Design a protein around this ligand. Structure first.
Ligand code: NI
Ligand code: NI
Ligand code: NI
Ligand code: NI
Ligand code: NI
Ligand code: NI
Lengths: 553, 100, 101, 553, 553, 100
């Protein structure tokens, strides 16, 4: 039997050699591989394949997956392939060919009576995003981020307090404890950062022992060489990560003095470009070092016409020393080159919580438009650029904070945090958001309707976000010390617990597709950024995709 | 009024349509959400008037044309569906390819 | 520019390659329509369909996965079958096999 | 002392011989009995009866009810009587005469210091509805159904997944467990259905042992004779119910083959008319058998002008074989005759979750209008038709699923799930919805107002829907096996647990006021339905009551 | 170094001698004291004081506060002073000078790595309000009251039931238990009142043993001399408070008979003016007795043009005996004189739940306008009047119900329930509401915005109102008996538990700034109120502050 | 439409502005919330039109004058901030002393 490739694409989604446009951008992805056996694809429906004795086997629950995503087009750092995804016990069981071994060939993902089905044909499936620069100013941020496709949120705060408005710090044992307890109520995985600004190591050890997975050094609390050194010493001891927002005022020293204080130790530099904070005007030079894991916050991504104008007031003499067109323009290119490894939000503190993914793709679009294909690109597609950029908000943030053993990508053994997208709305509005094997939120039509599609369709929380089901499908990350001291039992935390590890051993070379260490310089007077003497710059966009065609406001 | 959850939910659609209605009046080419809201609201009012499902399935295809919406929008909306209380109870109205 | 548009490369896909196939003339002797799915064990379909059941043993319809063939009352037509694979163990349907073959 | 019957009706509600119109329909009910002692009615208020030493006694909590609904007009399958209702420990204590035995005669429901009062004079009180065809596509369905007057929801699903969109199945132990946990968060009683489509009995026993109270056989998973037989065998073993959505395609056999496979065993046939699924075009003939408990889904109830037109697309060659004007028209009459015993929704899968009660009364209205009085009717009232129809969404669904020992009617010992209605809004918008003795939801005016009545008045959840109070006032139904294996303790379920029983012994003869087994046939070519050779049909409504006069949209 | 007082006020808020207008009223407060050391004020921000080694010390968590409110202008019954507030373990640690003892002088509130900061410069901080006349008609009242600045709610009810609509009673053990469990879900401290109308003491003891902290005697349940006596006898035994709504009908006796039945025992008279209930037309004379703690409900506060007109229908022969212009006008003056000691709402039963604070200040404004300065006033400010009025909804309600050891004022050791106000919105719309050391609700802008200030800004619940964090930051008050019988463990209450005590020993002389016992009389025919023969009256306002300038509707 | 929480939140602001708009039309002097809502909605529409942040920062100061609002209102609003989807994405518009 034969079938035309067009009819096939309409029935099972695209296959090898087919290209798909990402939303309304100029980025095109080409299916690199297809793990199916033509003619043996599984489809659910009346008279279709997944039925008793046919595509559904006779195996017991233990011998089959709980959930199968059929004919999914996976877009991950390791590849863009077509395959079925199997989920078992809340985790990714396998990527391959689903079906019934009794009558079908090459079945690697067994479907049985205990298997639920999610039809992914014609859809793109990605790992849930991971935002590592969250200011816990309000609990509403969790739903906003979840809706955008972000499933893990790392940050600090206690609510709308002055300290939190400015820094990602959950100060001390009491607040840390209270926030760990409040975390059980949120539908995303959570890890907290304590206040790392102190020159007494015991004051830091207490916070780590209380539960934080990292310490934030912020200039508002004093980003002095003494504080930075103290925080890194405790980090090396307790295997937790340090996030830095340096001395913008150059009060205690210049960028080189801060770098000297860090002493080659692992550290995550927040908003490395500088607009969001850091030694004026050269904190961006940090991306040249092997021990620095650099990230960008999202208001500066990508460089557009209104960027500079809006930034002055979001900030409001050192304003014009902090807001620089030169470093803002360069940042985009540095992302395209892989010099900057992560993207984050900086939620409600010079950052948009629901725009991490959306902005990352806009930068990729603008860079393709301005710079053409990357040197690593093969074929007439943007597959490599896509892998490079998706890594910025998935696997790289996970590696930087020691949680890549649990989340960060679509790999066997990892928690099943997945986002299903229709190609036309990729990166803008997801079709389904799965948390730990359960749908946590999705667009839903009229509740009283005869079908789930009638208007009004808007995002509403599903069963995966309800009480005990939620606790079972989310993770609260703890430091190894907190886990050992029995903090979870003491605070009576109800969610699944995960421990962070490998924070001190990760380096720039470990950032997937983003390990460039450029010989970068910044002119002290003009602020021009140069890599190997070449000027790094770009043009501001007047119009961007993933914008006015999708939003009501 | 004793508004049920569904009645309150429809108020959201109505208000979304007010936004679209005013922008269309300004001479703007409508985007994805604006288009869906405007056409949907039209149908609900048709049901309130007492028009039949059959009549609305057709009428709904003449609310917006391809020249009144942004590029790609017509393709993003293969159909529009909405339910409303007709004289004979709640009925589903499906409009296929509403924008041509 | 169409958001999320496909660029399907032209051509065709060959389905169920390298598998044994056979053709059989089937006739619906019932007074009601019968529709058969791609992976249903053809030898165990509605008894109203008259055909050589012995030849259809271990076979299913050689059509795109998920599709079906319809037989109106009195309709006679020739269909192409393809043999099951995997363990070739048949369970379910009308309960005529319930084991290998 | 004397008082005119009109002034009396205005003060204590109607009494024996008085008639009341149900909403804006043509259905009239006549009070059959009044359990009060004229002059001794209890009324609450300043200077009224329920006061210390007067209508309120000196007894301790153990010797008096927690709640009394005064002067209620009860409408249940057993009668339409005026009486006071006593609730104690979350259950119906007694139906009779409330007061203080110290100074009042014939007191059967003692009122004391521990008694709360709900004024029901001029109101109609009914048992909470029971919907047995729920697709758990989204958690929002619970509030929608509760608001309509439905207090128990039986069905299956895991959220907005392909499998759930199409079938009422919660596949396997993992999903069953997760959904049982999520159930604690919903304000209605819940029982789950697993996937019954498999030819290996152990795969089914696992699901029952995990917690499901029934198994759904759906054609999308393969409604073959082998699967049906396997499911019924396990059902007979474990005392759980089976719900069927037959082979519409006639792929494995015709309706008679399915009936043969069932082999006289008890089974609940979903949407027996066929539009929602089933052997085309004669699945409706199932209502002739003694072992079949037939129900209808609600989009086809009642037959109206727009019915056919809307149905084609809600479905979208076998479309015109499934959507038949002939069987749709007949279904209404079969309900009026008692051949069809239940009504359900088929929530968001060709059914409206908040319209089960509303549509049942519209069918009754249309049948009275077209067919006149029933042969069982006595007096100039529609009392019997009313009892016949109310049984369709209360007691009958409860009997069919083995939960009638807990809910289903206003009888002593049963859980106090009651709905209070103003006659003008009967079946459309309730005044109060009580779950387990506590008000769970009700229309509420301006929160900051001087009284609870100022606008805007809309349904808002009350104390009975909050945290622990909710857990105490709702029931999660389990299979006898799950209860025995200690599933509630393992999953740490917080709500009250109830076990199902008597699912295999219930038959058509047991359906209250709906036990007709007609000699029914369907013409294979024309689709005409005939009972004893007589053509069964009806005319489509152009306008219906309980519609445009009550809804804003 | 020197700095002008204006620039100083702009930078750290007002200091000694500076005056501030309360919202848009004519009330002005003058800073009486400032506990800072000029030049050593703590300010948070980039390059500011609270930084490592500077304003932030090296002490461990145990040796520093968890939260510090910097440069707060405190307005409490004991004073109007400028100072820093320290909060530790959810309680008020100290009021003084915050900082780092290592380099700063006079530090009484140590700031360390474990300290969160809330910038209060230019803000007014007050204790959370306490409403003791709550009808638990719906759970939504809690959020409404919290938003207005009320953090403790005492009352009774079971939801929108007839008994609750009319009285503040939670009838019997079952309902009391259910409501105690539901309380864990609400973001305010809660104490319940049972039904005190019974002549059998055991029926009352049961309710107290079940958990109520008081008993409400309401005329609708029979406010007879026998019932009143019985309730007071049990109150004296179990150390719980009694709230009274007397016999308006004069059925069992006149006001003097009720007073005689009370027999000099402590009792809280609700809506003492009479419009909301009580012996017509002289229940107001109760404020002359030493054992009476009198409060007003809010619809009559203050006397305005539309007051009488609206009241007739909110009530609807004894209507015109209950609604009296004479007693309504006098009530305002009696509050100004300190004859009436508390203000409350009477939520949704002739009272506005979100208008207790707002109306108390409107009365103060109208009294200043009509009567000028109080005899106790010193200086050209309204400091004493302000202290007198704030006491009416904070400390006095707490003393009356035996919970002043936990809440009621900004004093060391008390729970940290604080409200932060911008002077322009004082008493109308708060900036931050802190419950037990955590922000529970606050106005919040666009969730996806770059900052928390963009529109739309509306009140949204924060972390202090979420699950377990909420349980840790709220208190459920129990009677000493209930606490002893282990009710909290039995019902498995998750919130912090507090016990009431000192209810029987509090008298009129104990009411802060409101201990006046006037020689008051009421003319039986004309209803004129006279104190020492002088006519007490006032003029109705045509326009009021804290009204149309702040609300959208 | 697939409305996200933020899109639904903005519908609240739009509706609040409809209230203010009708009252201003009646000739009433606007209060605090009405003023904030009216000016904010204006800016959102400007962004939908494609105006720049710079242009709106100025235009927003000429929507209401001191004579169209209640006494004290101008002082209660030192600035107004709102974000909207411009052709180049979401941008923050801050209008200082909008009412003069
Ligand atoms: Ni920063
Ligand atoms: Ni930040
Ligand atoms: Ni079905
Ligand atoms: Ni169904
Ligand atoms: Ni009262
Ligand atoms: Ni009251």
């Amino acid at each position: 039997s034969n079938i035309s490739r067009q009819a096939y694409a309409d029935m099972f989604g695209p296959t090898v050699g087919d290209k798909v446009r990402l939303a309304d951008t100029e980025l095109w992805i080409e299916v690199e591989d297809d793990l199916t056996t033509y003619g043996e694809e599984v489809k659910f429906g009346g008279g279709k394949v997944i039925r008793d004795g046919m595509g559904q086997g006779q195996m017991l629950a233990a011998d089959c997956v709980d959930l199968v995503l059929t004919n999914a087009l996976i877009v991950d750092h390791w590849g863009i392939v077509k395959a079925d995804i199997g989920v078992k016990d809340g985790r990714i069981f396998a990527i391959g060919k689903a079906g019934n071994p009794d009558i079908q060939p090459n079945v690697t993902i067994p479907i049985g009576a205990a298997t639920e089905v999610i039809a992914a044909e014609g859809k793109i499936v990605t790992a849930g995003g991971i935002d590592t620069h969250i200011h816990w100013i309000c609990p509403q941020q969790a739903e906003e981020a979840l809706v955008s496709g972000v499933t893990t949120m790392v940050g600090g705060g206690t609510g709308p307090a002055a300290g939190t408005h400015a820094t990602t710090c959950t100060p001390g044992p009491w607040y840390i404890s209270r926030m760990l307890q409040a975390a059980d109520s949120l539908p995303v995985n959570i890890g907290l950062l304590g206040k790392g600004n102190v020159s007494q190591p015991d004051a830091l050890r207490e916070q780590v022992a209380a539960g934080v997975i990292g310490l934030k050094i912020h200039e508002d609390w004093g980003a002095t060489p003494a504080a930075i050194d103290c925080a890194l010493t405790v980090a090396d001891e307790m295997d937790i990560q340090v996030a830095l927002h340096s001395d913008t005022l150059n009060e205690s020293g210049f960028v080189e003095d801060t770098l000297a204080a860090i002493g080659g130790r692992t550290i995550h530099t927040f908003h490395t470009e500088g607009a969001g904070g850091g030694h004026a005007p050269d904190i961006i030079t940090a991306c040249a070092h092997p021990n620095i894991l650099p990230s960008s916050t999202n208001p500066t991504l990508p460089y557009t016409l209104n960027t500079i104008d809006e930034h002055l007031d979001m900030l409001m003499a050192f304003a014009e020393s902090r807001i620089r067109r030169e470093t803002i323009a360069a940042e985009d290119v540095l992302h395209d080159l892989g010099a900057f490894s992560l993207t984050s939000s900086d939620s409600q503190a010079m950052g948009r919580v629901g725009e991490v993914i959306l902005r990352t793709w806009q930068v990729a679009h603008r860079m393709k438009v301005q710079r053409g294909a990357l040197a690593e690109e093969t074929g007439d597609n943007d597959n490599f650029r896509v892998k490079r950029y998706i890594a910025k908000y998935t696997i790289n943030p996970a590696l930087t904070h020691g949680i890549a053993h649990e989340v960060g990508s679509i790999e066997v053994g990892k928690l099943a945090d997945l986002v299903v997208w229709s190609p036309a709305f990729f990166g803008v509005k997801p079709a389904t958001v799965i948390k730990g094997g359960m749908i946590a939120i999705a667009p839903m039509g009229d509740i009283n309707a005869s079908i789930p599609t009638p208007q009004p369709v808007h995002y509403r929380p599903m069963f995966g976000a309800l009480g005990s089901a939620r606790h079972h499908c989310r993770l609260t990350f703890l430091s190894q010390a907190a886990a050992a001291n029995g903090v979870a039992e003491r605070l009576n935390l109800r969610s699944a617990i995960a421990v962070v590890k490998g924070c001190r051993t990760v380096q720039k070379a470990d950032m997937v597709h983003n390990s460039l260490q450029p010989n970068i310089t910044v002119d002290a007077q003009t602020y021009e950024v140069r890599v190997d003497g070449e000027l790094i710059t770009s043009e501001p966009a007047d119009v961007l995709p993933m914008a006015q065609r999708y939003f009501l406001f | 009024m004793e508004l049920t959850p569904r009645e309150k939910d429809k108020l959201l659609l109505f208000t979304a349509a007010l936004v679209a209605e005013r922008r269309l009046a300004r001479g703007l080419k409508l985007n994805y959400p604006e288009s869906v809201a405007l056409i949907s609201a039209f149908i609900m009012e048709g049901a309130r008037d007492g028009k039949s499902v059959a009549s609305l399935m057709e009428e709904g295809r003449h609310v917006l044309t391809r020249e009144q919406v942004m590029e790609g929008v017509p393709e993003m909306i293969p159909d529009i569906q909405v339910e409303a209380t007709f004289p004979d109870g709640s009925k589903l109205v499906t409009v296929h390819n509403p924008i041509i | 520019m169409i958001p999320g548009e496909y660029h399907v490369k032209p051509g065709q896909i060959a389905l169920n390659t390298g598998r044994a196939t056979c053709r059989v003339v089937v006739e619906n002797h019932g007074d009601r329509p019968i529709q058969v799915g791609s992976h249903y064990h053809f030898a165990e379909v509605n008894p109203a369909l008259k055909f050589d059941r012995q030849q259809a043993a271990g076979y299913r319809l050689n059509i795109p996965a998920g599709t079906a063939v319809r037989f109106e009352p009195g309709q006679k037509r020739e269909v192409e079958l393809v043999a099951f694979a995997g363990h070739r163990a048949v369970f379910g349907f009308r309960g005529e096999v319930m084991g290998p073959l």
